[PDB]
Every structure is written in C-alpha cells, then in structure tokens.
Amino acid sequence: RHGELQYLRQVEHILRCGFKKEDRTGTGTLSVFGMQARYSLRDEFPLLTTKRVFWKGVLEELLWFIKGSTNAKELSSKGVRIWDANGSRDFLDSLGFSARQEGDLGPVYGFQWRHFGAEYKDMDSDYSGQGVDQLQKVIDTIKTNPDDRRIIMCAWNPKDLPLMALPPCHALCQFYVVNGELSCQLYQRSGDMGLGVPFNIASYALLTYMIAHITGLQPGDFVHTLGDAHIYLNHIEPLKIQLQREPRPFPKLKILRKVETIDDFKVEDFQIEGYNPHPTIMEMAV
Amino acid sequence: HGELQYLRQVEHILRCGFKKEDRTGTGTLSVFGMQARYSLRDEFPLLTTKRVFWKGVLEELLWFIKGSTNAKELSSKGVRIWDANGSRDFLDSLGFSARQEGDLGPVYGFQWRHFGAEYKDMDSDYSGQGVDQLQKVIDTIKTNPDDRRIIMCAWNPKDLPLMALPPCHALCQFYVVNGELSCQLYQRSGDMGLGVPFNIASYALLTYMIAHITGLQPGDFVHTLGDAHIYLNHIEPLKIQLQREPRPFPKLKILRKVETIDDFKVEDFQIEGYNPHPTIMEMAV
Numbered sequence: 001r002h003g004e005l006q007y008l009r010q011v012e013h014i015l016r017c018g019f020k021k022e023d024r025t026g027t028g029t030l031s032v033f034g035m036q037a038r039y040s041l042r043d044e045f046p047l048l049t050t051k052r053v054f055w056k057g058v059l060e061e062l063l064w065f066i067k068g069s070t071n072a073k074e075l076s077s078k079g080v081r082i083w084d085a086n087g088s089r090d091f092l093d094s095l096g097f098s099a100r101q102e103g104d105l106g107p108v109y110g111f112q113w114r115h116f117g118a119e120y121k122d123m124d125s126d127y128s129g130q131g132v133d134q135l136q137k138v139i140d141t142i143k144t145n146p147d148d149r150r151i152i153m154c155a156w157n158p159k160d161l162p163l164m165a166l167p168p169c170h171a172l173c174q175f176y177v178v179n180g181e182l183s184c185q186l187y188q189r190s191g192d193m194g195l196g197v198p199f200n201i202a203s204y205a206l207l208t209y210m211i212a213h214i215t216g217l218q219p220g221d222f223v224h225t226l227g228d229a230h231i232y233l234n235h236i237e238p239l240k241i242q243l244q245r246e247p248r249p250f251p252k253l254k255i256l257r258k259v260e261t262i263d264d265f266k267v268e269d270f271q272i273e274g275y276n277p278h279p280t281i282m283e284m285a286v
Numbered sequence: 287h288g289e290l291q292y293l294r295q296v297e298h299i300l301r302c303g304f305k306k307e308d309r310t311g312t313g314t315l316s317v318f319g320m321q322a323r324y325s326l327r328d329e330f331p332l333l334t335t336k337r338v339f340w341k342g343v344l345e346e347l348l349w350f351i352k353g354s355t356n357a358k359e360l361s362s363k364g365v366r367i368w369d370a371n372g373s374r375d376f377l378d379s380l381g382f383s384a385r386q387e388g389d390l391g392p393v394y395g396f397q398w399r400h401f402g403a404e405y406k407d408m409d410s411d412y413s414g415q416g417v418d419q420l421q422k423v424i425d426t427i428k429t430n431p432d433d434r435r436i437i438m439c440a441w442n443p444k445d446l447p448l449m450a451l452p453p454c455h456a457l458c459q460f461y462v463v464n465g466e467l468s469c470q471l472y473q474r475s476g477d478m479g480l481g482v483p484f485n486i487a488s489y490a491l492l493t494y495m496i497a498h499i500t501g502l503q504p505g506d507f508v509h510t511l512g513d514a515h516i517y518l519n520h521i522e523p524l525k526i527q528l529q530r531e532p533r534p535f536p537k538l539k540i541l542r543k544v545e546t547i548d549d550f551k552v553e554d555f556q557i558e559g560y561n562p563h564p565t566i567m568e569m570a571v
C-alpha cells in the first residue's frame with residue numbers, strides 16, 4: 001500500500017467529517033483536531049505525487065534552519081521566497097519591529113534549534129556558542145545513547161514567542177532508534193492540508209535522512225502528528241479533483257557524498273530520483 | 287467503549303512492538319508513534335480494566351496548577367509519586383547536593399506558570415515572573431477560541447539540566463469547535479502498563495477544569511505517544527488485563543461553580559460510578 005494514501009485518507013476524512021471552523025485568515029476551514037500518519041523512509045522518500053511539492057524550497061529552507069539563520073533574505077537569495085512576506089517592512093512594522101532591518105524574522109526555528117534560550121538581538125548578531133544547540137544534542141545522543149526516550153528538538157519557545165514574526169507551526173520533534181533505523185515524529189500544531197502539510201512531510205523526512213546519514217543509521221519512519229488539521233474552504237474543489245488521482249511510486253533520495261557533520265550538507269549533496277508528480281492544480285491563505 | 291482504544295494499543299505493542307533496551311535496564315517492547323482519542327462528552331476516561339490511582343491524579347494536577355516544585359507539598363496530601371525524585375540520594379546523583387530534600391527543580395508546575403523565569407529553589411517567590419502559560423491558554427480560549435496556537439509546553443531545553451527528570455508529558459494543545467474544548471497531549475515516552483492510564487486521567491481532568499472555567503463542554507482528549515512501551519516484566523500482568531471486559535466509564539462531576547483555575551480544590555470533584563476490576567505490576571526505576 002502506497003504511503004501517500006494515508007495523506008489522501010486524511011484529506012478525505014476532513015472533507016467528510018471535519019467541522020466548519022473560522023480561522024485567523026478569514027478564509028474559513030473544515031477542521032479535525034488530532035490526526036496521525038506514518039510515512040516509511042525505507043528505500044523511498046515521501047515526496048507527494050498527486051500534487052507537485054516545491055522540493056527546492058524544502059531543501060533550501062532546511063539548510064537555512066540548520067545554519068541558524070533568522071534572515072529571510074538569506075533564504076530568498078537561494079531562489080526561495082516563502083519567508084519574504086513575513087520579513088517585509090510593512091509586516092514587521094505591523095508587529096512593532098520598526099527597528100528591525102527588512103528580513104529580520106526574530107528568533108524563529110533555526111535560532112531555537114541552534115541557540116535555544118540565548119538572548120535575541122537581531123538577525124546579523126553573532127550567536128556562536130550561545131544557548132542550547134538542540135540539533136547537535138540530538139545528533140550526539142543518537143550516537144551515544146540511541147535508546148534514549150528524550151531525543152527532542154523544540155522550536156516552541158513561550159518566552160521568545162512575542163519576538164517572532166510567526167509562532168512556530170512545526171513545534172516539536174522527537175527521534176527514536178531501533179533495529180539500526182532512525183525515526184522522527186513531528187508535532188505540528190496546525191496543518192494546511194492542501195498546501196502546507198506536503199511540504200512539512202518532505203521537510204522532516206529530509207531532516208531524518210540527513211541525521212541518519214550523519215549517525216550511520218538507516219532512515220526508518222516519519223510519524224506526522226497534527227493538532228488542527230484543516231482544509232481551507234477554497235481548496236475543497238481542487239482537492240476533490242486531486243483525490244481521484246492515483247499516487248505514483250515515491251521517488252528516492254540519494255546523498256551523493258559522505259558527510260560528517262550536519263553543518264557540512266549543501267544543496268548539491270542531494271538528488272531526488274524518479275519524481276513524477278501529477279500535473280499541477282490552489283490559492284494560499286495569508 | 288473508549289477503553290478499547292487503550293487496550294488495542296497494548297495489544298498492538300505486544301504483537302508488533304520491537305524489543306528495545308532502556309534507561310532502567312528492564313527492557314521493553316516498543317512502538318514509536320501512536321495516537322488514541324478519548325471522548326470526554328458525558329463520561330470520564332478513568333480506565334476500568336485496572337484501577338487508576340485517581341487521588342494521585344487529582345492532587346498531582348492541583349499541585350501542578352499552583353506552580354509547586356516541592357515533592358513534600360504533594361506528599362503531605364498522601365500522594366508519594368514524586369518523593370523518590372526529591373530524595374537526598376537521587377538529588378546527590380544528579381549533582382544537586384546544595385538543594386534541599388523535595389526540591390525537584392523547575393519541572394511541570396514551574397514551566398506551566400513561570401516559563402523562562404530564573405529558577406532559584408522551591409521556596410522562592412516567582413509571582414509575576416516568566417510566562418504563565420496556563421492562564422494564557424484560558425484567556426485565549428475565552429477571547430479567541432479559533433486560535434490554532436493554544437499551547438502549554440513543559441519541555442524547556444534551557445532548564446532541562448536543572449530538573450529532577452526531563453518532562454514526559456511534554457506539550458499540550460487546546461482546540462475549540464461547536465462549543466467543545468478538546469486537548470491533545472504529546473507524551474514523549476509512555477509506560478503503557480502503569481503510567482499511561484494515569485496520564486490519560488490527568489489530562490482529561492485538566493480539560494474538564496478548563497472547560498468549566500471557560501463555559502465550554504469537554505470534547506476529546508487526543509493522546510499522542512512517542513516511545514510507547516511495555517516493560518518486559520509487565521507482559522504477563524497486561525495479558526491478564528486484556529481479557530477483562532471494560533465497564534462503562536464513570537462520570538466526573540464538579541460540585542460548584544469555580545471562577546479561576548487556581549480556585550479548584552479536591553472537594554470540588556466527585557467521580558461517580560467507577561467500578562474497576564481489581565488492581566494487578568512492578569515499577570521501573
């Protein structure tokens with residue numbers, strides 16, 4: 001059974017049993033609270049095929065997280081503009097960060113991952129050795145104590161929340177080792193099923209591939225856990241069309257050289273093989 | 287019956303979990319990633335195939351809510367579940383020889399009411415310091431029930447080295463639709479035999495309290511697990527438990543109108559109709 005069917009079953013379940021729920025963007029949703037899917041990472045990569053996923057954005061965003069950057073312009077300069085609106089002059093001013101340069105998102109994911117608890121000044125400051133390097137801690141624990149049941153990386157920081165351009169969505173993840181296989185579970189508090197969730201799945205599956213490579217393990221499962229799983233009201237008709245498509249076999253992800261530390265990965269080390277998504281289809285809520 | 291969700295998770299681990307050694311040296315059968323949904327509508331999921339220590343559930347939660355990190359304050363209620371982790375021996379093993387007996391460091395109660403504050407010891411006055419996540423959750427439920435960010439997080443990487451134990455029930459999220467309040471817990475590690483039934487009751491209770499404070503009806507408790515495991519010396523006891531038919535879940539009654547979360551007391555709560563099967567299981571250390 002194709003792993004993508006779990007995602008399609010979730011979409012189906014929301015369209016059939018979700019409740020109408022108003023939301024921040026004013027678009028309105030159909031919503032279910034509490035969902036879980038399991039995507040195998042064993043000799044395949046769960047890049048969804050019934051609608052193309054912006055893989056270049058997935059990879060560049062994750063590398064940007066890993067170097068701890070909070071500058072939207074540093075991601076934009078790679079051709080990936082997904083964070084640009086949240087670092088714009090007008091958006092930053094609406095939140096009262098007039099003293100911030102354009103692009104300064106505040107202490108969002110990459111900062112929390114690499115420097116949790118350090119004091120947030122601006123995006124150009126030097127934070128070397130400041131705060132808790134959760135990402136390296138996870139990697140070290142996987143190597144020395146793979147049975148550990150507390151291998152956690154948490155972007156949800158209640159103290160830093162008011163400094164962030166947006167509150168963390170993919171809020172907490174946990175790693176797990178058994179039978180030589182590394183698995184990862186993401187707690188995602190809020191999931192745009194049509195446009196966001198496929199990207200999120202690829203993002204954390206990639207992270208698991210990267211950490212498995214660094215630690216000499218084989219990728220196991222990505223477990224995707226949702227809080228508010230929702231379909232925006234203007235996605236119902238496109239998704240009903242998407243749901244009639246049969247998934248194509250997932251692609252593979254190849255890592256093209258031996259990499260020793262998480263910081264040393266670069267875009268050219270990765271190749272998605274055999275990705276043949278169905279032809280395109282959706283308006284994004286703001 | 288909602289207890290079948292728990293029993294089916296136990297069965298799944300017994301049938302499909304992998305052997306995995308663990309911190310305690312006991313060894314486990316283990317599945318990574320599970321989820322169950324327990325309805326809170328007109329019933330309370332206090333498990334029946336084995337008696338749950340409801341007095342400990344209620345008193346521990348009230349102890350969380352007032353922000354205590356002192357195991358002696360819970361013990362004086364006749365609930366000793368935290369006493370070993372506050373003992374001198376345990377504190378000396380972690381490197382806390384300067385801390386007095388009972389001082390658990392900045393565990394759940396501190397994180398829930400004072401996230402980000404500087405911890406000193408269990409006797410300090412933390413009034414107004416840090417983020418009161420618990421009150422923030424209640425306020426947001428009242429003012430913006432559609433909010434998709436209603437989170438209380440006990441996992442604090444900065445404070446982890448100061449805690450007696452790393453938080454197990456690590457983060458929870460609340461959700462409102464159709465006048466019903468739901469809660470999802472992310473529990474990183476679940477002892478299915480002895481811990482999980484207590485965890486379910488604890489967060490089902492928390493949801494009843496907040497619904498009462500906010501004028502809403504309890505909806506679902508969604509229980510999400512990371513390492514869901516059965517200790518190897520629990521296998522035979524649990525196989526007995528799995529043959530027991532569940533009895534209908536008791537009801538939880540709140541005995542007066544309470545206005546703020548800090549004003550609940552033990553006397554305000556009554557469990558009606560709890561007829562569990564006889565208790566059975568050795569505790570990992």
Ligand SMILES: O=C1OC(c2ccc(O)cc2)(c2ccc(O)cc2)c2ccccc21
Binds near residue numbers: 054081
């Ligand atoms: O701008 C974009 O943000 C999205 C994004 C998702 C996860 C992530 O890690 C980074 C970005 C996103 C999509 C839908 C939403 O409701 C909110 C955000 C996204 C996905 C695909 C293409 C563009 C975008």
Ligand SMILES: O=C1OC(c2ccc(O)cc2)(c2ccc(O)cc2)c2ccccc21
Binds near residue numbers: 477488
């Ligand atoms: O001492 C006790 O800790 C338990 C407990 C669980 C959750 C909680 O919120 C508070 C306590 C527990 C049981 C098994 C474990 O592997 C670890 C802890 C527990 C459950 C039932 C009776 C006694 C105890």
Ligand SMILES: O=c1ccn([C@H]2C[C@H](O)[C@@H](COP(=O)(O)O)O2)c(=O)[nH]1
Binds near residue numbers: 167190192195434435
């Ligand atoms: O990584 C992400 C970030 C955002 N979203 C979606 C979920 C919501 O539709 C919207 C975030 O809005 P709030 O939950 O914060 O209200 O974007 C995702 O699906 N994945």
Ligand SMILES: O=c1ccn([C@H]2C[C@H](O)[C@@H](COP(=O)(O)O)O2)c(=O)[nH]1
Binds near residue numbers: 309455477480
């Ligand atoms: O609220 C709790 C606290 C602990 N445990 C169990 C899970 C593990 O069996 C053990 C904690 O050990 P570690 O996961 O931290 O190694 O206690 C629970 O089930 N619920």
